[PDB]
Every structure is written in C-alpha cells, then in structure tokens.
Design a protein around this nucleic acid. Structure first.
Lengths: 37, 93, 271, 46
RNA sequence: AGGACCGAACCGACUAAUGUUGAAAAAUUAGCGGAUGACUUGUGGCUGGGGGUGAAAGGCCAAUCAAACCGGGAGAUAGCU
RNA sequence: GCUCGCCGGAAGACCAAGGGUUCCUGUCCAACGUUAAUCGGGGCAGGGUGAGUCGACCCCUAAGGCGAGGCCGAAAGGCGUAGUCGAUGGGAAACAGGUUAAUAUUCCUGUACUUGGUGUUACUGCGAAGGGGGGACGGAGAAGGCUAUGUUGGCCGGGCGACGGUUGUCCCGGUUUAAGCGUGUAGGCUGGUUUUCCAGGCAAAUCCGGAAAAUCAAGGCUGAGGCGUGAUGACGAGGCACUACGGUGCUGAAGCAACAAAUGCCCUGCUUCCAGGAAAAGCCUCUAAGCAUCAGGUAACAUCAAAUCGUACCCCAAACCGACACAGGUGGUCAGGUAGAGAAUACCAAGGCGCUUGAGAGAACUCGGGUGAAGGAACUAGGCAAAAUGGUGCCGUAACUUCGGGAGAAGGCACGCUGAUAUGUAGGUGAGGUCCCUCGCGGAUGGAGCUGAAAUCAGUCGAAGAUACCAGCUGGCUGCAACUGUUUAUUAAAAACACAGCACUGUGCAAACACGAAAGUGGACGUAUACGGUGUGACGCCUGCCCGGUGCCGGAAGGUUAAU
C-alpha cells in the first residue's frame, strides 16, 4: 500500500497538458487568460 | 540398450492420489514420479527391469511448480514429471 | 484504341483507357518470370531516398531479352503480352531451336512474325543488328551504348532513335530527348520503333489510379512550415522566394549535369 | 482505449532480450552496467 | 461496371446532453460520416533525435514533441524570487 | 427450490495473443471484496494438465536480420557474396462414442490412417548443393450442383388434462450416427497414341521445349455430394432395481420421407477486368560424375519406431492492456426459431446472467424520459435541442446539366383479416408407374405428394392495417472547394492537404536526385511516352502588358581578380 501510494502520488509530476490545471484538474483558465489579453 | 546406472536414477516415487488409484484399479496404469529429464523409453525400460513387469506404453506429463509463500517470502516449488505407465494384462505392481 | 469511359460515377468521368485486343488474356510464360519485391522508395539504410513511392499492385518481373544474343537463328513471335514493369508491351517469341524469350514489342509486330538477330539479318522491324550495318536515317530502338551490354536507349513506349551519321567507328544518334549522341557503331540496335504509342493518351481519371501504380501523394512545398521545406510559412499563401528543391537547390532552370567523363560523346545537348 | 503496452513475448525478446543485448557493443555495455549495479535480472527473458 | 447508391459488422468522429475531486488522464447516451476501396485488420519486419515519418497539423515518434526518453558534463548559469 | 426480469451475430460456446495455477476439492474469515459474508479469482493444504495423427519443435521459404571471405571506414564500425536464420505463408497422418470434482481428437471402447528403419521374397538400371514439371497462388461478378442446418408429414413413446371444451384436421418428446474404405456422379480442364529428327534447358538426358509425319477419335487428369460399408455396433425418449437421495447400475421403442436452404463445399473452378496478381522445399520426373552379376530402385509381407516440449483455467474479460474486481481497448472461429431483404430490429431456444451496499420516503433542484389547452420560431448568436419524415408496389416528377444525372425531386394512391377465382393459383421440386437402351449415380413420358408468391372480386373489424421495434424532413437563392478521400491521437474536419489534369524545369544512364566520412543502396532490374523537383489544381471559355530589380540560362571581348 505504501509503495502504491508513493508511485500514485508520483503520477502527474512530469505532465504536459495545458488546458488542465496540474495535468488533470479541469477549469476555464483558457477563457480567463484569453479574455484578459 | 540403456545402461543400468542411468536406469536406476529415472524412477523417483510412486504417485499416490485418487486419479492414480482409479488408474490402477480400473485401467492397469501405475502412476509414478520420474526424473525430470527422463524419456519414455527410459521409463518403460526402468519399469521393465526394476519392477520386472511388462509395460504396454508410457504417457508422460510435466507438472509445474506452485508459487507458495512463507510469511512474506514467496517461492516457486519445482517442476516434476509424472508418468502414466500402462502395464499389460499380467501384472501386480 | 483509346476509349473515353462514360461518366457514370465521377472518377469515371475523365478516364481514358488504352485497350488492346491483341494482348494475351491469360497467364504469362512462367520460367521467364521472377519475384520483384517493392521497396517503398527506401534504400539499404531504411530511409526514404526517392519520395512519393509506395503501395500499388503486386508485380512479377519478366526477364526481357535486351541483349538479343541468339544470332542467325530465326524466331517467330508467339504472342504479345502486358508487362507491368514497362510502358511498352512485350512479345513472347519462340526461336527455331525451342527457346522462348520476351522481347520489347516494336510497332508493327503481331503474332506469327519472323524476327532475327545478328549481322546478316534482313532490315525490317524487329531485327536486332549492329549499327554499322543499319542504314543512316533509320528509326531504331533498344539501342546499346556499349557493345555487348544490352539495350538502354529508346525502350519506353512509342519511342525511337534516329541514326543520323556513321563517321568512322561511331554513329551519331538523335535521341528522343532531342540530343545528338555518339555511340560506338558495334552496338546492336533493334529496327523499328517500340510499340505502344497510344500509352501517352491515357488519362487516369482519379486519384486512386495513381495510387495503384504506386505513386503516393505529393505535398507541395509552399503548404508546409519553414522547418520542412524552404517554401514554408506565411500567413496565407505567401511565396516570395526563388523556387527550390526541398534541399535548397534551384528548380526552374538550374542545370544539374556534371559528368565530364561522357561529355566526349555528347555532340549537342537537347533543346 | 488502446494503451501503449500491447504485449508480445516474441517482440519483448527479439527487442530487449539477452541474445539481442549480446549482439552488439552497446548492449554488452548495458549488461555490464546491470551486472555491475548488481541486478537480479539482467535482461527481460522470462 | 463503379475511389457507384441505401444500410449492419468494421473503420471513423459531425452535433447535443451528461461527465468534468469522471465509470473513463478523452468516455457514455441519442442522433452522425465511410462502408469493394486512395478501405479495414492480424502477425512479423524496417526507418531514430536536428534525425525519422508526415494526403502538412509543427502532426506523430510509448498518456512526453518549435526538437523524445535515460544517464552523464552538472552543484550549468540565475545582476532574479 | 419455485416464480420474476435481462442477453441470445451475445451478456452463449471454442481458441490465438497475453496471463500464469486464477482450474478442482477440503478447510479459515484477520486483511483483500467500495456493505455483511457462512461466500470468493482472498488465506492454507491437497489434487489436477496423459498425443505417431492437435499445436510447437522439424523440412522450406517472404519481408527482413546476421554474415566466412570481401569491399569500405580515425577506432568503435558500415555494407554485403557464399551461406545461415526468419512465419504471419508452403510440407505426412484420427474419427465416433464413453468417462473425471478437475484432462481429453491425448484416457477407455470400436474402427482407422501416415511416415521412416530393419528383414525376407519377386522383378530390376540406380545415382545429384544439376535440368524440366509441379507446388504456384489477383479484383469483381454470375449461376449451377450440393451439404450443414431447419420446417412439415410419417413412425415410435407418453398425455387426455386445476376453468368452458379437448379420442382428434388434438398435445408433449424423440426420430442421431463420424473418420476410414469401395463406387464413381453434377461439374471443370485437356485431343490422345506411335515413330523419326534438333543451333534450346551452362554438360548429359529416354524428361521439358521444338519440327516433321502416321493413325485413332477417344483417352486422361480433377471433382463436391449421394450411395454401400463402418454399424446385427454405438447412441437413443423413457422405464426397471437399489438408492451414503447426490444419483448409481440394468434395460431401451422408432430411428424415415418430402420440402426449404447457406455467407460453407465443388471452386486454387467459370466469366470478365485492368491495377496484371509471393518464394523455396516436400512431390513427380531426366540424367552427369560414379556403381554396374554389388550398391540402390519398385512391389508384397513381417517387424520395430514415431522422440521432446505445450495441453489446467480466463480469453470482448473480475484472470490480457487500462494504478482498481475500472461503463474503455482486444484478432479468429460456431451462428437455432418466429416475423424480416437481412449478421438490422423485436421476442425467444441452447446456454449464461440479475451488473458485491441495502431499507424507506415520494420536498426543492439536477439528470434520463412521457404527455400537453390556444399559439406555432414569437426562442435564439443560430430552429441548438426536440418534434416531424421514414416501408413496398404503382402513378408521377421541374429548372439546370458534363446528357450520367438532378431524382427517392416534388406530390399522391394502395396495404389488416376472411372467402372465392383455386377443397391453395402461377411458379419451384418431383415419387410410384410406363418406354428405351451404348443398362445405370441413365435419359424420355407421367404427374402423386410437398412447397408456394402475387393479383382481382366479395365481405368484415377497428379511431387507426407500412399499426410495435425498425425506418429519408422537403423545397428555393447563394459563397467556397470540382468530385471519393486526408488532417490538428486529447477544444479546429474545414474553404486547409490530397487529387486527376495542366505547365515550367532538371535528367542520355555509372541519369538528375536522395541516404551514406566511404563502400554501397534507393531512383529502377526503369531509359526521355521515363524519372526527379516546383507551382497550379476536374471540366468550359481563357491566361493580357513589363526583363529596370532579384534569380536562372547563355556569351566571351575588355576591366578587376586567389593559390603559384
């Protein structure tokens, strides 16, 4: 359980996805930034 | 011919179970654990010459070893080989 | 015979076929066939060296006799066949000693027709013979460039080469290019012109026809990004550059012959 | 959805197996580092 | 006959709604396009990082791509926090 | 255990890949199981995988890998000849029934087949990393002959029935049988046989190829299925005797015919079309060197051998890939009934499941749905969403057009059930009988029986007959793109990319060009009617002027101009 918890905390450490906050969290930040311009 | 020094090392134990038992008491076949590298000619010759009976035909399967564990330490057992030795009409053992 | 297809279903609207009723409907002659594996345009390094190649139909190679070595033995043309590896058709011929060979089919040549290779051959279309024995001003195909080597000039369909001069050990040849080239006069050549001229009149009609001759699509350079092709980029259509290959060498004019070894043999470049 | 690891034993072995590490200079250096690090299984064989 | 027509398998992914700490790190449901072809699929093989491949989008190259991943130079450098 | 619901071209069954004991039995409930658990794919122990014929190994090869020498390269190393590996392909052979809690084409019963070794006997020219054949192989389409399978009748066994009727044009069930061996059919292909001669198949050849004759008109090859045997056997609905009520033994009737019919088989066929459709071995043949009263070949018989590894279990999934017992992904094989064109769809059979939290209540609100007065886009960025349309036959159908289309334009009418025509027709199939015989798996006649649309007329029911499910909304003007396609895996499917077609330009073959310190390889076993690059992008009418700038091509006089 401890090994699975360390690896499953280590899941989104090297991500790329920009529309999702922290790799996973859905948001509207594309529209927020885009409307700020 | 097969040398007798080879031919003694092949048979290893008689196999006791209920499939073995019904094979003896129903179809003349004695089931026995053999050497892992033992061919069917060696098992046939070794039952011909070590229990002095007449063997009709041998059928050999190989049984895979079970991964057991002690405590939190695993281990596979060990593969062995099982020979279904079908005797002729005149036999005892 | 060229035939416009009737325009049922687009795709057939613009197709022109070149049908030939005298080609053999059936299997080719087997012991002159061999495996011809398709490459994809890719060398022994795996890399695409020639672009736009790949797919298409499976093809078997046909050993065509370009050398024409059986001299003095006559041969009757057994039949004409479709060859997938070429523009022209191939004639299967039967020599008098019982050896069949495929040759390139010249223009007039039908089934049941005598051809004959060698020095003392009659001058009539189909006979391969050395060019010191052919008259000047004769159409001639399947020309050798080195004696004994095999034919390499005028092999593609409807193509001939005219012999214009016999100055010494050399014959001046008007190649189909328009180029005047000197060839050694001991080089064999086959009389007549090679015979499927109407090949150039077909029109293919759709995209998949090109695809089934093994010609993958051609992305044009200006549609790419600048990292890909020198033409690249630009906010709608934007050319602005002198037209080049994908490797920067000027297309549209720039001469790319450098031999210096065979410049002796070129009397006049093409025009 | 079709994930990246679609297993095949024959491609596992032809690709990353022992006879294929030993087949070249750099795979032998791979095996040398795995032995030197001291590793229970060197290649992926079975 | 047909890169033919309608339409299942099969391939896809046009719209909407849900979902958005999901059942799912891209789906479900209802409709939707192709469906004998430039189709689709299984098994194997080949191409490799300023390199591949690209019916071209800077797309794709193991959930990573205006230059992969791993290890090293390496405690780079950081007049900045 | 009885009911109820769900899937049933799957949510059934069998595998491959992948996993690796999850399989089966006994036992335990700590943790794992989104709850409880006596249960479990959990814990512990024991058991379980039986092969000459299935698969692998093996023989042969494709793509491709590796590669003695070799060519090449600062070194590492690249390429590659001989070779050697490499299946996803080619190559010998087994089927039915029974059995275990758990394996079975493997065990048992019955009946078989294949390939090698050895021995005997009879005849005898055998012999290759060599020659020839063969293996040997496309897309589409069309029927014909069959079968699997199903339906109905006959037969056989059982029932006469909780509620009106049910001894009959009644109800329920069964009606199965293989490989192998023998026969040779519906098809399909090909003229056959004998003699002589030859510049071909690196040599040889009796084989192949070729050229002459002569004669006969048939022979040969291949082939589904049927039929006979296998099989007076097995299986068989059910009864009988004991019954650790789990079953265990014994016995066992009929076991036929007609029709329908595949996407399976004849068929690797046939017709056709361009886009012109693997290789090598096994196999059959020919001989060379050699061996020639020997060895070897062929045939019969006998005898021996056929090793090794896999075999459990899941396999559209709770066992594989997805961190999960995850609404996702995952190749092949089998494919019953009724309605239906159908593998759609509805309801069902075989079979398998009810999705590992439940009990209530019946607020707002959210999600998925049903219906809605009058109105009917007034909503809105926009008819988004929903509603509507929807089948078959017949009538009918405009502009425009590349003469194909548009077109399913548009718009209509008919549709159930019953009866008659006709105790079910047209059609399909086709027995007994009869006739002939080159006599049988034959052809001619004949129509019993079975199957069976579709139409008209008459009648009848309902509000409604395409009644459910399933199943086009239509028309008008216009921009872009000719069209089918492709693309931003994961906010963009588009007018963008592609495309056929056009043009310009390079390229004479050791081609230009590309990958490569090089060797080499692709271009291409191609040769200018070809190949590469660039732009434009079907088709129709067309494509005007400018060479001063930048580029390219050509020129060589003069100026300037490096190493030396």
């Amino acid at each position: 359980m401890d090994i699975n918890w360390r690896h499953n905390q280590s899941t989104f450490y090297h991500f790329t996805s920009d529309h999702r906050i922290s790799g996973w969290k859905e948001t509207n930040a594309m529209y927020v930034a885009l409307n700020s311009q | 011919m097969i040398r007798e020094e080879r031919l003694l090392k092949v048979l290893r134990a008689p196999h006791v179970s209920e499939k073995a038992s019904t094979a003896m008491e129903k179809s003349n076949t004695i089931v026995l654990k053999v050497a892992k590298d033992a061919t069917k000619a060696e098992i046939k010759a070794a039952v011909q010459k070590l229990f002095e009976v007449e063997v009709e035909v041998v059928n050999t399967l190989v049984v895979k070893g079970k991964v057991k564990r002690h405590g939190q330490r695993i281990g596979r057992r060990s593969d062995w080989k099982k020979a279904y030795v079908t005797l002729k009409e005149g036999q005892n053992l | 015979a060229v035939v416009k297809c009737k325009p049922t279903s687009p795709g057939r609207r613009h197709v022109v076929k070149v049908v030939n009723p005298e080609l053999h409907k059936g299997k080719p002659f087997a012991p002159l066939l061999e495996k011809n594996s398709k490459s994809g345009g890719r060398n022994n390094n795996g890399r695409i060296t020639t672009r736009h190649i790949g797919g298409g139909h499976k093809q078997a190679y046909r050993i065509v006799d370009f050398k024409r070595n059986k001299d003095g033995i006559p041969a009757v043309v057994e039949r004409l066949e479709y060859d997938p590896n070429r523009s022209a058709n191939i004639a299967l011929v039967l020599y008098k000693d019982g050896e069949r060979r495929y040759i390139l089919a010249p223009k007039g040549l039908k089934a049941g027709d005598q051809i004959q290779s060698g020095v003392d051959a009659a001058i009539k279309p189909g006979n391969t013979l050395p060019m010191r024995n052919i008259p000047v001003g004769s159409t001639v195909h399947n020309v050798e460039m080195k004696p004994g080597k095999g034919g390499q000039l005028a092999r593609s369909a409807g193509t001939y080469v005219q012999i214009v001069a016999r100055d010494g050990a050399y014959v001046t040849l008007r190649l189909r290019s328009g180029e005047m080239r000197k060839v050694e006069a001991d080089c064999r050549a086959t009389l007549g012109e090679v015979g499927n001229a109407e090949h150039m009149l077909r029109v293919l009609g759709k995209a998949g026809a090109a695809r089934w001759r093994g010609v993958r699509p051609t992305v044009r350079g200006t549609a790419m990004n600048p990292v890909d092709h020198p033409h690249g980029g630009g906010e709608g259509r934007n050319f602005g550059k002198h037209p080049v290959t994908p490797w920067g060498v000027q297309t549209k004019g720039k001469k790319t012959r450098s031999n210096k070894r065979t410049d002796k043999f070129i009397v006049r470049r093409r025009s | 959805m079709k994930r990246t690891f679609q297993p095949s034993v024959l491609k596992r072995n032809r690709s990353h197996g022992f006879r294929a590490r030993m087949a070249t200079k750099n795979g032998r250096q791979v095996l040398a580092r795995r032995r030197a690090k001291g590793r229970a299984r060197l290649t992926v064989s079975k």
